[PDB]
């Protein structure tokens, strides 16, 4: 066995978790009551004495109405009360409150519930941690938790699914502060972090699903498809990325530069069959990335293609040939120019009645490109604008954070930028 434990922190983390676990249940045939008529799905689901299949998941959100979504939702019977951790007040958009005030209060309880899950594993691979950059809880508590997991599970892999802020849909002006604070503190404690730019997802739902104003459900159902593509060979007996350490092997040659660019296709409107070559071309169109950035402004370190559904290798290699001839895909020079390809035969699955159409074949490309540092630069600039005037800094300091943590986090991001530049030359 190769169990993975999922932890969802903050509202974004919990609601994206709802979407993924619903999608996992649809893919593995687990009913909402937890019953079910390849045994790889046990890496993500345990089984009780009643024969019910329970997600290896912990949900942490200090506002009870968010957690109430889980415990009164369609899949509520999947979850046991000990998996759901809530409080009185959330972090009020304040990283310092999430990390220090709430964090010191709830960290042992959260680690206790994680430990209970881990005790049920015989070959625990590690943790998949879902959270926002911009939320006070998603940023502040997640970073404390990652530190403590590094202490408590020293040899275990830790992957992140991180919601990168988009002001269009955010309600917090201080999200750039929270994003830099939590990136600095988490950097040394995560092995592989897949950022999801809310602006990128929003644009994909508008362009490819013809939705004027995409809901959080829209964004989250699209995010679930990416996560599902990434975890498919953990939950089925696939061939590529069959355990958590393989993600760092296949995508992260340098530890600090552990932020792969995900590209996904096809996204077809439900109210509306593409070839291997077409969906393969789409992986090299910036409009389908999960983070807004320009790969031409970078070099690749690693690139994997994860195919799902009716995909035959001759059709993939054909598609790759035609791209290399017509386009310049520049790898760093200490790295081979090439692709690791995996095909998972399990067909892409969509929520019935949702706005995603069911396709015969899909693909997710996971690439480590220095171009993703553009996303860091946009964040760092907004940080700099506000921090020069110490705007809002007193809310963080009022919660016990030292002002110098702003400067120390921001220097780290400067170093991250130069690390990306050095690697890209």
């Amino acid at each position: 066995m190769r169990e993975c434990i999922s932890i969802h922190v903050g509202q974004a983390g919990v609601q994206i978790g709802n979407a993924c676990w619903e999608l996992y249940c649809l893919e593995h045939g687990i009913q909402p009551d937890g019953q079910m008529p390849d045994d790889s799905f046990n890496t993500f689901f345990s089984e009780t004495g009643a024969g019910k299949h329970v997600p290896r998941a912990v949900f942490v959100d200090l506002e009870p109405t968010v957690i109430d979504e889980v415990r009164t939702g369609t899949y509520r019977q999947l979850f046991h009360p000990e998996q759901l951790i809530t409080g009185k007040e959330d972090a009020a958009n304040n990283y310092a409150r999430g990390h220090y005030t709430i964090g010191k209060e709830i960290i042992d309880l959260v680690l206790d519930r994680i430990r209970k899950l881990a005790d049920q594993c015989t070959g625990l691979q590690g943790f998949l941690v879902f959270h926002s950059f911009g939320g006070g809880t998603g940023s502040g508590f997640t970073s404390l938790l990652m530190e403590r997991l590094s202490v408590d599970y020293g040899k275990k892999s830790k992957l992140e699914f991180s919601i990168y802020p988009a002001p269009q849909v955010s309600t917090a002006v201080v999200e750039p502060y929270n994003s830099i604070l939590t990136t600095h503190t988490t950097l040394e404690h995560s092995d592989c972090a897949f950022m999801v730019d809310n602006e990128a997802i929003y644009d994909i739902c508008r362009r490819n699903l013809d939705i004027e104003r995409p809901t959080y459900t829209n964004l989250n159902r699209l995010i679930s498809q990416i996560v599902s593509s990434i975890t498919a060979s953990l939950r089925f007996d696939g061939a590529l990325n069959v355990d958590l350490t393989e993600f760092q092997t296949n995508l992260v040659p340098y530890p600090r530069i552990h932020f792969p660019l995900a590209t996904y296709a096809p996204v077809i409107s439900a109210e509306k069959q593409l070839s291997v070559a077409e969906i393969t071309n789409a992986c090299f169109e910036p409009a389908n990335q999960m983070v807004k950035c320009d790969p031409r402004h970078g070099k690749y370190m690693a690139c994997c293609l994860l195919y799902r559904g009716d995909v035959v290798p001759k059709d993939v290699n054909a598609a790759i040939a035609t791209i290399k001839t017509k386009r310049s895909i520049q790898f760093v020079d200490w790295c081979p120019t090439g692709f690791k390809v995996g095909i998972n035969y399990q067909p892409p699955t969509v929520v019935p009645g949702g706005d995603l159409a069911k396709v015969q074949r899909a693909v997710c490309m996971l690439s480590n490109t220095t171009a993703i540092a553009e996303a860091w630069a946009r964040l760092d600039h907004k940080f700099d604008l506000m921090y020069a005037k110490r705007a809002f800094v007193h809310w963080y300091v009022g919660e016990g954070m030292e002002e110098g943590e702003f400067s120390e986090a921001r220097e780290d991001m400067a170093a991250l930028e130069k690390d990306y530049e050095e690697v890209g030359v």
């Binding site: 009020a92 002001p167 955010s170 309600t171 002006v173 104003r213 506000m386 809310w395």
Partner: protein
């Protein structure tokens, strides 16, 4: 983060407070006998933020009614929704404040303040998770101004970790009740700088001007002004009271609206202006001085932060479009060093009598003009020590007067400093 404890102090405080409870009881479907009779469960999902639910399926405002004079609270009991308030939440003295801040803040108010705090504390103990306090009051009088700021301070000392929110009515010679309004207001502004987290500046100067100029009311009455106040108070509290994309609370409001702790004085604004309608037009009144409830021109300064609430059925994409279009065409009037400093919420529940409404909460450096106007009126009286003996007779030193106005002139300077700051 659920319950707000609302307090109303003095005559203005209890009049605009009563109108507030009138208006939002109607929106939430509560009659004066506390019985709910509404049509939608959007009206009750967050009704505990403002109402306690009693035994008989009835709702009681979490409201405390305070005065040193028994009169105006007697007239609130007699008012339309008078029977909805808990009878033991009326805390009233007998001998009044004499229009004198020193009397409400020191001698008379001290005699009553611990009675109020007992009622405040009984309400705070019946709260699952106390968000904080919402106080309505005038700054120009004696009880709301002097005793209200005394109440603020004592509440801060007993609940230092809860948010303190005020609706603070600013005086105007255009609609005055007492000759010492400049002293009372300046002494109180010093208290709010130090002890509140969020203060909506409700300016009687601007209310009068809106009624006279835009509404053609040649002789505005308090009823006319208070129709504007109650429309504003409904609009700014929308996201506290109804479920929506933004489920706001008083601490998130402070975190995102207040970039510097002293700079927590908001310019409210409302459209359409009405006496007792397109999305693009609604958006534009953000910069219209004619729609501001503080007598300041937003184009005289720069917005640090802005909150906009759109109410009624309307395209949230068209709203987001116009809001961004207004921000860019007016880029010179937002500070560049706070990116994305306007946030908009929409709520499908229109206010009564309107199909669509817009409400603006601005943290603008142009608010300094309100405080400069008070300062000049303070100085014209104080340089001649006019009426001062009524305050020193209460034990006050003259230095408290000079300290209060220099603090207020500092607030003005601080607002000017960020107005001029560049990226």
């Amino acid at each position: 983060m659920r319950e707000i404890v609302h307090i109303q102090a003095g005559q203005c405080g209890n009049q605009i407070g009563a109108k507030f409870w009138e208006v939002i009881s109607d929106e939430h479907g509560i009659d004066p006998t506390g019985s709910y009779h509404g049509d939608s469960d959007l009206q009750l999902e967050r009704i505990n933020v403002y109402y306690n639910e009693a035994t008989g399926n009835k709702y009681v405002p979490r409201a405390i009614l305070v005065d040193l004079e028994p009169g105006t609270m007697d007239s609130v009991r007699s008012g339309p929704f008078g029977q909805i308030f808990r009878p033991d939440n009326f805390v009233f003295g007998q001998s009044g404040a004499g229009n004198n801040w020193a009397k409400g803040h020191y001698t008379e108010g001290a005699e009553l303040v611990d009675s109020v705090l007992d009622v405040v504390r009984k309400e705070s103990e019946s709260c699952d998770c106390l968000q904080g306090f919402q106080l309505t009051h005038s700054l120009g009088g004696g009880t709301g101004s002097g005793m209200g700021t005394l109440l603020i301070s004592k509440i801060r000392e007993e609940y230092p970790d809860r948010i303190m929110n005020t609706f603070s009515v600013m005086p105007s010679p255009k609609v005055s009740d007492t000759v010492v309004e400049p002293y009372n207001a300046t002494l109180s502004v010093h208290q709010l700088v130090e002890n509140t987290d969020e203060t909506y500046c409700i300016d009687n100067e601007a209310l009068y001007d809106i009624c006279f100029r835009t509404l053609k009311l040649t002789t505005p009455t308090y009823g006319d002004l208070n129709h504007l106040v109650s429309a504003t108070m409904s609009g700014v509290t929308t996201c506290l009271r109804f479920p929506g994309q933004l489920n706001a609370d008083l601490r998130k409001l402070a975190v995102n609206m207040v970039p510097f702790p002293r700079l927590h004085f908001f310019m409210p604004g409302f459209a359409p202006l009405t006496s007792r309608l397109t999305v693009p037009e609604l958006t534009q009144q953000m910069f219209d001085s004619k729609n501001m409830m503080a007598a300041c021109d937003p184009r005289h300064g720069r917005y640090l932060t802005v909150a906009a609430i759109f109410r009624g059925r309307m395209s949230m994409k068209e709203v987001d479009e116009q809001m961004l279009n207004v921000q860019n065409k007016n880029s010179s009037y937002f500070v560049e060093w706070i990116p994305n400093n306007v946030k908009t919420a929409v709520c499908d529940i229109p206010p009564r009598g309107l199909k669509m409404s817009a409400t603006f909460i601005g943290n603008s450096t142009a608010i300094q003009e309100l405080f400069k106007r008070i300062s000049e009126q303070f100085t014209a009286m104080f340089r001649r020590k006019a009426f001062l003996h009524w305050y020193t007779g209460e034990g006050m030193d003259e230095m408290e007067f000079t300290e209060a106005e220099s603090n207020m002139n500092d607030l003005v300077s601080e607002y000017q400093q960020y107005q001029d700051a560049t990226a």
